[PDB]
A paper describes a structure:
In this study, we successfully co-crystallised A4V SOD1 on wild-type background (no C6S mutation) with various compounds in C2 space group and provide direct visualisation of the binding of ebselen, compounds 1, 4 and 6 at Cys111. The structure of A4V-compound 4 shows a different binding pose, although the chemical structure is quite similar to ebselen with only an additional methylene linker. The seleno-head group of compound 4 is almost perpendicular to that of other compounds and the chlorobenzyl group extends along the dimer groove, filling the gap between N-termini and C-termini. Notably, compounds 3, 4 and 5, which are methylene-linked analogues, greatly increased SOD1 melting temperatures. This result can be understood because the methylene linker makes the aromatic tail group more flexible, allowing the chlorobenzyl ring to localise between N- and C-termini and interact with Ile151, which is a residue critical for maintaining hydrogen bonding between two monomers. Thus, the binding pose as demonstrated in A4V-compound 4 structure might serve as a bridge, reinforcing the interaction at the dimer interface.
SOD1 is a homodimeric copper-containing and zinc-containing enzyme, serving as one of the cellular protective mechanisms against reactive oxygen species. An alanine-to-valine mutation at amino acid position 4 within the SOD1 protein (A4V), accounting for 50% of SOD1-related gene mutations in the US, causes a rapid and aggressive form of fALS, thereby reducing survival time to less than 2 years. While the mechanism of dimer destabilisation and the increased propensity to aggregate remain elusive, several structural and molecular dynamics studies have demonstrated that the A4V mutation causes structural changes in neighbouring residues close to the dimer interface, which potentially perturb overall dimer stability even though the interface interactions are generally conserved in the crystal structure.
Author numbering:
A (entry chain J), B (entry chain A): 1 to 153
Amino acid sequence: ATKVVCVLKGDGPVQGIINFEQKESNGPVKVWGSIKGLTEGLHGFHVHEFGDNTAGCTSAGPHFNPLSRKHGGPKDEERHVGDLGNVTADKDGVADVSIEDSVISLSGDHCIIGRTLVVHEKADDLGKGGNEESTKTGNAGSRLACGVIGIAQ
Amino acid sequence: ATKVVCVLKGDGPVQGIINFEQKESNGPVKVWGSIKGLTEGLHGFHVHEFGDNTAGCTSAGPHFNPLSRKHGGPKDEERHVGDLGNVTADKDGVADVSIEDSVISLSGDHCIIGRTLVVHEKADDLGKGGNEESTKTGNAGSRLACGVIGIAQ
Ligand SMILES: O=C(NCc1ccc(Cl)cc1)c1ccccc1[SeH]
Ligand SMILES: O=C(NCc1ccc(Cl)cc1)c1ccccc1[SeH]
Ligand SMILES: [Zn+2]
Ligand SMILES: [Zn+2]
């Protein structure tokens, strides 16, 4: 098995740890962990292109998009590889993340190792917002917290 | 080139940005950048095994050691892959890092992408300290700052 981890930090109170695990080599990736300090409700959750935090979360660049597609929800055929949809924060500002995705990978063509995971300000509209922004970023707003995706023990 | 970057943060005032660049695929890696907030003098500078910051720099694990050797200076044949020797901080607590290494790589089996770079409290004795600690950590002391090594533009 391949295990990967990411610690999310940012300028505000948002922080969390997200684990990634992939049992079979080309098979699904379990993404789980906890984020705290979020406003109640949906928050966009994406792998961006660059493991670059030199200028905060901004320098992470756009959603990881090796196949040059438009932005979607994780379940869409038309999506960015990094398009992991939303996470939900409870009334206490805690999101108990648990996702399974078959498009991201921890080995081979769509490896997300050394890239950035970002949790965004607002809901990801999953590309159904009917503006240009929707098909790029899902209108998820600013980057509350991020981290480089690294090899874990 | 293949370009990689790492933002070092920790508990104290130590922080910096380190760039890694590798022009040829099996060729030398240029490591450069700046770290500030250091005490004047030598500081141990290593790639540790895990891109894991879940418990601060501690969770990064030992020096990256895929060939199971004892700790050395970068110039030694007997070294950890992650053994990059020392960086020097000037009277202002700034280290202008500039290193070239042919053992680390940004592509190939023992890639350092998604691992951790750490700058340590004291000098790395390059394994010549005559105790057990010397042949493991070079006696470089605590981890002042670290970051996950991520893909840059
Ligand atoms: O394959 C990679 N590095 C080897 C490795 C992966 C995971 C683990 Cl747990 C240990 C070792 C790698 C490097 C860079 C980008 C994507 C990938 Se996928
Ligand atoms: O090169 C690798 N995997 C894909 C990749 C290439 C280049 C870059 Cl910049 C990022 C990711 C790779 C495979 C195996 C072990 C270590 C490594 Se590093
Ligand atoms: Zn997207
Ligand atoms: Zn070492």
